[PDB]
Amino acid sequence: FQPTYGVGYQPYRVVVLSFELLHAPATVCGPKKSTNLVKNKCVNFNFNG
Amino acid sequence: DGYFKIYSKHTPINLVRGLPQGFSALEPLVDLPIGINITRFQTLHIS
Numbered sequence: 293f294q295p296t297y298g299v300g301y302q303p304y305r306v307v308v309l310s311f312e313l314l315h316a317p318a319t320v321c322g323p324k325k326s327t328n329l330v331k332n333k334c335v336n337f338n339f340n341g
Numbered sequence: 342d343g344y345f346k347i348y349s350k351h352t353p354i355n356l357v358r359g360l361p362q363g364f365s366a367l368e369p370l371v372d373l374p375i376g377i378n379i380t381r382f383q384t385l386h387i388s
């Protein structure tokens with residue numbers, strides 16, 4: 293790899309993400325949605341299921 | 342089912358020989374989302 297190397301020949305960093313589904317409990321997941329707390333109004337809620 | 346749990350409790354005692362005629366719950370302390378099909382165990386030794 294050289295700086296004068298043209299496109300398609302320059303050093304490109306590559307990270308492969310391999311996903312697997314073992315029967316063990318899932319650990320890595322996504323973030324929350326938060327929203328905002330509102331009171332004294334008939335609403336619906338999803339507090340941790 | 343793949344969860345290893347450990348509860349705990351501490352108390353001061355003065356009787357020497359046996360477990361006292363007392364009652365006390367064991368509040369949960371630590372949980373682990375890992376599973377190994379343990380069959381045996383052994384308590385360590387100190388010096």
Ligand SMILES: *[C@@H]1O[C@H](CO)[C@@H](O)[C@H](O)[C@H]1NC(C)=O
Nearest residue numbers: 316343375376377378379380
């Ligand atoms: C559960 O026990 C079985 C024995 O039938 C063993 O093959 C398996 O490896 C155990 N599971 C774990 C996570 O060690």
